[PDB]
Amino acid sequence: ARGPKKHLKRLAAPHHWLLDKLSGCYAPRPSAGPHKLRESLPLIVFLRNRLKYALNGREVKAILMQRHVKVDGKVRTDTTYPAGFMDVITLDATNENFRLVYDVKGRFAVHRITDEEASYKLGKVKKVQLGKKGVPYVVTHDGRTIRYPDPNIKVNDTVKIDLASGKITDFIKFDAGKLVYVTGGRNLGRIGTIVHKERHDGGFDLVHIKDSLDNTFVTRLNNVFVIGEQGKPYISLPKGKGIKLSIAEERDRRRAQQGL
Amino acid sequence: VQRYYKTTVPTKPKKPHDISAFVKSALPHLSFVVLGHVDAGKSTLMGRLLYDLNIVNQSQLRKLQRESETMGKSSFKFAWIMDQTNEERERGVTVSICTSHFSTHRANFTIVDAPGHRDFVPNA
Amino acid sequence: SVGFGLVYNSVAEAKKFEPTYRLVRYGLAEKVEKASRQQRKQKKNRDKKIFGTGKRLAKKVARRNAD
Amino acid sequence: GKGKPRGLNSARKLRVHRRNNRWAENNYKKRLLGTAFKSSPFGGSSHAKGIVLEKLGIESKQPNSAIRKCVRVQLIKNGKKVTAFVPNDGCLNFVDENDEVLLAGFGRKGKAKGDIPGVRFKVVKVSGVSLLALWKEKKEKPRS
Amino acid sequence: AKVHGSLARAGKVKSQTPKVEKTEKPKKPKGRAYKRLLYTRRFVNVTLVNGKRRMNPGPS
Amino acid sequence: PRAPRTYSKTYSTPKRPYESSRLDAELKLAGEFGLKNKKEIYRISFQLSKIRRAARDLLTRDEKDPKRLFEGNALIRRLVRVGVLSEDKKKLDYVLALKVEDFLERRLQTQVYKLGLAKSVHHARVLITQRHIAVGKQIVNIPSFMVRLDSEKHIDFAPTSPFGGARPGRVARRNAARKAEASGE
RNA sequence: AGGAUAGUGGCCUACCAUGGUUUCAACGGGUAACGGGGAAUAAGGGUUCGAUUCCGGAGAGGGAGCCUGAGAAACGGCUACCACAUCCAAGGAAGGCAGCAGGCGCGCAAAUUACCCAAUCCUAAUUCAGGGAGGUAGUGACAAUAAAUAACGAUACAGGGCCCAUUCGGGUCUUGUAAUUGGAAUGAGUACAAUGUAAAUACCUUAACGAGGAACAAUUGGAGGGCAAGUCUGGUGCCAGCAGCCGCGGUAAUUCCAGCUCCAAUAGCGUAUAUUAAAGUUGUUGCAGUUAAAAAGCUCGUAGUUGAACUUUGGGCCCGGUUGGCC
Ligand SMILES: [Mg+2]
Ligand SMILES: [Mg+2]
Ligand SMILES: [Mg+2]
Ligand SMILES: [Mg+2]
Ligand SMILES: [Mg+2]
Ligand SMILES: [Mg+2]
Ligand SMILES: [Mg+2]
Ligand SMILES: [Mg+2]
Ligand SMILES: [Mg+2]
Ligand SMILES: [Mg+2]
Ligand SMILES: [Mg+2]
Ligand SMILES: [Mg+2]
Ligand SMILES: [Mg+2]
Ligand SMILES: [Mg+2]
Ligand SMILES: [Mg+2]
Ligand SMILES: [Mg+2]
Ligand SMILES: [Mg+2]
Ligand SMILES: [Mg+2]
Ligand SMILES: [Mg+2]
Ligand SMILES: [Mg+2]
Ligand SMILES: [Mg+2]
Ligand SMILES: [Mg+2]
Ligand SMILES: [Mg+2]
Ligand SMILES: [Mg+2]
Ligand SMILES: [Mg+2]
Ligand SMILES: [Mg+2]
Ligand SMILES: [Mg+2]
Ligand SMILES: [Mg+2]
Ligand SMILES: [Mg+2]
Ligand SMILES: [Mg+2]
Ligand SMILES: [Mg+2]
Ligand SMILES: [Mg+2]
Ligand SMILES: [Mg+2]
Ligand SMILES: [Mg+2]
Ligand SMILES: [Mg+2]
Ligand SMILES: [Mg+2]
Ligand SMILES: [Mg+2]
Ligand SMILES: [Mg+2]
Ligand SMILES: [Mg+2]
Ligand SMILES: [Mg+2]
Ligand SMILES: [Mg+2]
Ligand SMILES: [Mg+2]
Ligand SMILES: [Mg+2]
Ligand SMILES: [Mg+2]
Ligand SMILES: [Mg+2]
Ligand SMILES: [Mg+2]
Ligand SMILES: [Mg+2]
Ligand SMILES: [Mg+2]
Ligand SMILES: [Mg+2]
Ligand SMILES: [Mg+2]
Ligand SMILES: [Mg+2]
Ligand SMILES: [Mg+2]
Ligand SMILES: [Mg+2]
Ligand SMILES: [Mg+2]
Ligand SMILES: [Mg+2]
Ligand SMILES: [Mg+2]
Ligand SMILES: [Mg+2]
Ligand SMILES: [Mg+2]
Ligand SMILES: [Mg+2]
Ligand SMILES: [Mg+2]
Ligand SMILES: [Mg+2]
């Protein structure tokens, strides 16, 4: 409508930011960055609504602007910077390393990782082409391009970014029998080792998932994100490990463990 | 009968001042009425006393002289800055009173109009 | 009474992270007495009509009242 | 099959022959063609405002014998001359001619009340005095 | 029926009734305690049972 | 503009406003419990109607249903917790036969009377609205307090609000002041 | 095929072909029609509404044209015309509040020319600047939630429980009419202080004050039937009037005007209009068509709707899962 919109009203924000209906009128709009509008989360949301460190939106700039805050190696001094899937938030203060991963329910969790795990990240490649002067490059999901990759790396694989340089240290080939972390849709947060894949020449490919509890569900190709082999997760899985059991058994664990 | 409320309790203001000390400090105020005959020039005086100090200037009475020769009553150079009402300019006399306040350097004045006809005595 | 409290490591660090209105309630910083908000909006619009400094225009004013 | 069609592919006949039979109601007829908008001088409103032209001495219909003390009200937004009724025991003395009034209905959507011929509207307020409160003597009518 | 009619008695019956003063009665209870006084006159002490009960009898 | 604050009415009204068999029955509920209006009676029947909608919708479904067993156990346990539905009536067919009498019994106004702190059912209402007896530490001055089953034994006088401890009162102070001044010094 | 454009395209221009839509309702007209998420009603099926807190579109008096720039045919940008309209020493200059207030006018119909960025979030060479976005307060019976206007004793004569009842029965399980009275418990309000807030107001707190009826006094409708509550008293006398409907009014009007009593709802209630339920009086679920409104005079007849039976039915074994039975 006659130009790019700079505001984003409340109740137009996605559900996984968990913004309340009261206490304000406008929602934080993320800037241009590595991730999209719906699949990201700003730094103002991550501090005062998740960590509860800051209180007001002006006090968030006291943390981000000064020092000691960096995202994936670089500082990123911005209030509404979009930080989405597999973005390592490294705090120089308090020795805390963070990993943005989805919940079992499908919301961005406060997942604390060690110093050794925060050195690397995983990025799903989108496509591979030849750049200028015949140089191959792959495009990850966070916009990071990697010059001269392995020619064995094809579409819908993943890499292991060193976060000090742009080189690839490990790659996982897309195959049936890999731990796949679902990113998007109603099944957001589940894992479970692809049995087979339906071809569907013409778009919108479907992938069958059958996890360790024998729960069969179907996700699309845009939701598939491999995180390792059959077993042995290459990243630290959060609390719950993506099961999503029934709501009649959710109250069984909330009453026998803490209510009792 | 019961229509409204009525009390006998005066409410004191926030800044009370002395009444007898302000009258000596106040400006002298008058309220004078100008009576006379039908053709006596009582309104020509009202157009000249309201011409001197600050009320009307030469940028507003020279426009009235153009309307004086237009409507036929060219001899009424004065007596029209006080009364601006239809049927008064084409006939000459007023039909009702008007209150025009006046302010000078030392005192205070309030001049009002008065018709001279015997039919307009209850207006006077 | 359920409230909320903040305690710092020092006093000089407390002056830069606390807001400016809580320092007035506590006597740590004096409240500046500026003009009204609708008064600053009228002063700003009068500065928009003056292009430059304004002392150059005041020289034109003193030559107007003489002639 | 009771006259109506029961075909599985015959929803078009069952949705046109309803629309050919909705023109037999009263409520469906007054809404589309703008009968409340064009005629019935209140333009789709609940109340209005007018000026009293004269007072009426409308005799009540049979078997009753009374004079209902009506008035003639010319509206402002349309300019139509509409008879009006005073629903109290002697507020005709409380009203005069050439007065700003406030009108309302009877509760029958037009359709004059019966025993009062040719009158479809009543009088609530005259220049903002609330004639119900004058009949109970709560306030005073202004002089102008 | 007709249009021209008499207008001389616009509220004559009201202007000839004898205006009497309301009698100074004690105050009835308001709200909740009015429901207490209403509950007693229905089930605590029935006034009269002439087949069916009556809530406002006449002097006879 | 921010989000619309939603709101719904909590009472209803019958279709027949004038009924001899209904108005005599509803006035018995306002006499034995001390309600001031018919709206507080209609508020209970509106809350009683929303429970039959959560019961008749589930009795048309098949058993071993994760929608019937979840929402049904949540309907039974909430009524047992407030003390309305007894321990031996958890079969979910007994909440449809539940009446208006069992809801008004669990209100705080008649709970004071059945416990023995008020001398009458209307003396308890005056004890409610005048900052007296608390449920726990929290002082409640509203008669529509749904007293839970675990909160029944904790009903006691407040530390403030006299004949509760260590305070004579307000109007008793000036009564004792005029007695000691006129008779003494 | 060319031109144009960021790009596809009869988008535009040459040449050539004569097609394209339509009873499955084209085209034209009307809309007091922005569309949708939704709202009211509430067995089900439905009917009605959606200017408006969110999304998308359009517009800045009416149309048209263009500059800057990544993004505008932008109007708190410009130019022209038309319709309005402001200053003038009449030579000329300037203007678009369907932005926040506020004024006029139209109206049945709708608020302050207030305070501040302190939250919410956005823009800028960006922590510290700015924001009539937004927040706060005033106005406010649009609606919605919570519920003050009293509670408890004693006494006086009466009655209904009962132990013992031996001719004066008062005692305690006790309901009430009592124009003698008794101490209590309060809030509405006012008000130190604190808290709230950017600074205040209010709420939630809390010293000192604050019910004995002349109160800090609850109204709005109604009392023939529908429809709950009078055949009481006075006035009126087919008059005045009441009445959504049937109907009342000429001597004692159970519905008129009033008093008294009573009933319904209750800080709310009545009226008017629109709409829904009631309406199985729009009927797909679910109407009616001999005589109450209603099968064409009759047959042929396409579009539409509907359409006979029939082409793998049985039999014999081997593995578990899902509930429930015995334990
Ligand atoms: Mg931004
Ligand atoms: Mg910054
Ligand atoms: Mg004169
Ligand atoms: Mg003359
Ligand atoms: Mg300023
Ligand atoms: Mg400047
Ligand atoms: Mg016909
Ligand atoms: Mg009909
Ligand atoms: Mg008009
Ligand atoms: Mg008009
Ligand atoms: Mg007429
Ligand atoms: Mg207290
Ligand atoms: Mg082409
Ligand atoms: Mg093109
Ligand atoms: Mg072509
Ligand atoms: Mg052709
Ligand atoms: Mg042709
Ligand atoms: Mg053709
Ligand atoms: Mg048709
Ligand atoms: Mg059609
Ligand atoms: Mg619409
Ligand atoms: Mg329109
Ligand atoms: Mg809309
Ligand atoms: Mg409109
Ligand atoms: Mg609006
Ligand atoms: Mg679009
Ligand atoms: Mg034109
Ligand atoms: Mg424009
Ligand atoms: Mg504007
Ligand atoms: Mg604009
Ligand atoms: Mg002009
Ligand atoms: Mg000149
Ligand atoms: Mg000119
Ligand atoms: Mg405005
Ligand atoms: Mg604006
Ligand atoms: Mg205005
Ligand atoms: Mg106005
Ligand atoms: Mg209004
Ligand atoms: Mg701010
Ligand atoms: Mg504002
Ligand atoms: Mg605004
Ligand atoms: Mg207010
Ligand atoms: Mg008190
Ligand atoms: Mg009192
Ligand atoms: Mg009162
Ligand atoms: Mg009354
Ligand atoms: Mg009566
Ligand atoms: Mg009855
Ligand atoms: Mg009749
Ligand atoms: Mg009588
Ligand atoms: Mg009646
Ligand atoms: Mg009602
Ligand atoms: Mg069906
Ligand atoms: Mg049926
Ligand atoms: Mg029928
Ligand atoms: Mg016949
Ligand atoms: Mg017939
Ligand atoms: Mg036939
Ligand atoms: Mg055909
Ligand atoms: Mg067949
Ligand atoms: Mg078989």
The full DSSP string for A109-176 is --EEE-TTGGG-EEEEEEEEEE-TTS-EEEEETTS-EEES--TT--TT-EEEE-SSSS-EEEEE---T
DSSP state at residue A30 = P
Q: How many helices (H) and strands (E) does chain A have?
A: 3, 15
**Which partners does chain E have (≥3 C-beta pairs < 8 Å)?**
D, F
Backbone angles phi, psi at C64, to 5 degrees: -85, -40
The rounded distance, in Å, linking the Cα atoms of E5 and D69 is: 8
Residues 14-33 of chain E with CB under 8 A from chain F are 31-33
DSSP state at residue A33 = S
Judge contact between F41 and F100, C-beta under 8 A. Answer: yes
The rounded distance, in Å, linking the Cα atoms of D12 and D5 is: 10
Judge contact between D39 and D52, C-beta under 8 A. Answer: no
Distance measured from the CA of protein residue D137 to the C1' of nucleotide G251, in angstroms: 32
C-beta atoms of F3 and A22 within 8 A = yes
- Dump the DSSP string for C32-53: P----HHHHHHHHHHHHSS-S-
CA D18 – ligand 54 centroid, Å: 20
* 3-state SS assignment for residue A53: coil
F143 preceded by a cis bond (ω within 30 of 0): no
Judge contact between D71 and D108, C-beta under 8 A. Answer: no
Token match 């690397």: residue? A120
Looking at the 3D structure of chain A, how many domains does it have?
Answer: 3
Judge contact between F141 and F109, C-beta under 8 A. Answer: no
Q: Are residue A178 and residue A229 in the same domain, yes or no?
A: yes
For chain G, which bases have at least one atom within 7 A of a protein Cβ? 24, 32, 49, 53-58, 70-75, 89, 106-109, 114-123, 127-128, 130-135, 143-153, 175-177, 183-187, 196-199, 205-206, 208-211, 213-215, 217-218, 221, 223, 227-232, 234-236, 238-249, 256-267, 271-276, 281-285, 287-289, 295, 304-306, 322-323
Resolution number, Å: 3.3
Q: Are residue A137 and residue A154 in the same domain, yes or no?
A: yes
Long-range Cβ pairs for the range D16-24 (8 Å, 24+): none
C-beta atoms of D90 and E15 within 8 A = yes
Token match 């005629």: residue? D39
Whether A14 is in a domain gets the answer yes
CA count, 13 A, side-chain hemisphere, A150:
16
User: Could you state, in order of their start, the residue ranges of all structural domains in chain F?
Assistant: 17-185
For residue A34, give its domain range: 1-116
The tokens describing A60, both together, are 């968030």
Q: Are residue A180 and residue A227 in the same domain, yes or no?
A: yes
Q: Are residue A100 and residue A200 in the same domain, yes or no?
A: no
Nearest residue on chain F to A24, judged by CA atoms?
F2
Measured CA to C1', the nucleotide nearest D135 is G257
Q: How far apart are the first and last CA of chain A?
A: 56
- What SS3 string covers chain D? CCCCCCCCCCCCHHHHCCCCCHHHCCHHHHHHCCHHHHCCCCCCCCCECEEEEEECCCECCCCCCCECCCEEEEECCCCCEEEEECCCCCCCCCCCCCCEEEEECCCCCCCCCCCCCCCCCEEEEECCCCHHHHHCCCCCCCCC
Q: Are residue A106 and residue A190 in the same domain, yes or no?
A: no
The rounded distance, in Å, linking the Cα atoms of A158 and A173 is: 7
Judge contact between D105 and D45, C-beta under 8 A. Answer: no
* 3-state SS assignment for residue C20: helix
Judge contact between A41 and A17, C-beta under 8 A. Answer: yes
Region of A225 on the Ramachandran plot (φ > 0 left; ψ -120 to 50 alpha; else beta): beta
Residues of F in contact with E35 (CB under 8 A): 27, 30-31, 34-36
CA D78 – ligand 9 centroid, Å: 5
Residues 48-107 of chain A with CB under 8 A from chain F are none
Query: D79: exposed, middle or buried (C-beta count within 10 Å: 0-12, 13-18, 19+)?
Result: exposed
Whether A252 is in a domain gets the answer no
On whether B43 is known to bind a ligand per the annotation, the reply is yes
Whether A216 is in a domain gets the answer yes
Helix H or strand E encompassing B33 = strand B29-33
Whether A128 is in a domain gets the answer yes
C-beta atoms of F2 and A22 within 8 A = yes
- Dump the DSSP string for A165-225: SS-EEEEE---TT-EE---SSTTTT-------B---TTS--EEEEE-TT--EEEEEGGG--
Measured CA to C1', the nucleotide nearest A54 is G119
- In single-letter form, the type of residue at position E25 comes to K
The rounded distance, in Å, linking the Cα atoms of B22 and B20 is: 6
C-beta atoms of E33 and F34 within 8 A = no
On whether any CB of chain E is under 8 Å from the CB of F125, the answer is yes
Q: Are residue A9 and residue A89 in the same domain, yes or no?
A: yes
Q: Are residue A151 and residue A236 in the same domain, yes or no?
A: no
Nearest residue on chain E to F26, judged by CA atoms?
E39
Strands B108-112 and B29-33: parallel
Strands E52-53 and A168-172: unpaired
Residues of F in contact with A246 (CB under 8 A): 66
* 3-state SS assignment for residue A99: strand
Q: How far apart are the first and last CA of chain E?
A: 46
For the CA atoms of C54, C59, C65, C66, the dihedral, rounded to the nearest 10 degrees, stands at 180
Judge contact between A102 and A188, C-beta under 8 A. Answer: yes
User: Could you state, in order of their start, the residue ranges of all structural domains in chain D?
Assistant: 1-144
The rounded distance, in Å, linking the Cα atoms of C66 and D15 is: 90
Distance measured from the CA of protein residue E38 to the C1' of nucleotide G172, in angstroms: 29
Strands A226-228 and B29-33: unpaired
On whether any CB of chain F is under 8 Å from the CB of A245, the answer is no
C-beta atoms of F36 and E39 within 8 A = no
Cβ neighbours, 10 Å, residue A234: 16
The rounded distance, in Å, linking the Cα atoms of A135 and A129 is: 8
Q: Are residue A144 and residue A215 in the same domain, yes or no?
A: no
Judge contact between D120 and D111, C-beta under 8 A. Answer: yes
Instruction: Name the protein residue, with chain letter, whose CA is nearest the C1' of G244.
Output: D107
- The answer to whether chain C touches chain B by having 3 or more C-beta pairs less than 8 angstroms apart is no
Provide the β-strand partners of residue A98.
A89, A112
- Number of residues in chain F: 185
Breaks (C-N over 2.5 A) in chain D follow: none
C-beta atoms of F70 and A247 within 8 A = yes
Of D133, D124, D132, residue with least CA distance to D103: D124
- What SS3 string covers chain F? CCCCCCCCCCCCCCCCCCCHHHHHHHHHHHHHCCCCCCHHHHHHHHHHHHHHHHHHCCCCCCCCCCCHHHHHHHHHHHHHHCCCCCCCCCCCCCCCCCCCHHHHHCEHHHHHHHHCCCCCCCHHHHHHCCCCCECCCCECCCCCCECCCCCCCCCECCCCCCCCCCCCCCHHHHHHHHHHHHHCC
Measured CA to C1', the nucleotide nearest A49 is G120
Q: Are residue A11 and residue A99 in the same domain, yes or no?
A: yes
* 3-state SS assignment for residue E47: coil
DSSP state at residue A16 = G
Distance measured from the CA of protein residue D28 to the C1' of nucleotide G279, in angstroms: 14
Experimental method: cryo-EM
Q: Are residue A166 and residue A180 in the same domain, yes or no?
A: no
Q: Are residue A13 and residue A106 in the same domain, yes or no?
A: yes
Chain Cα centroid distance, residue A59: 26
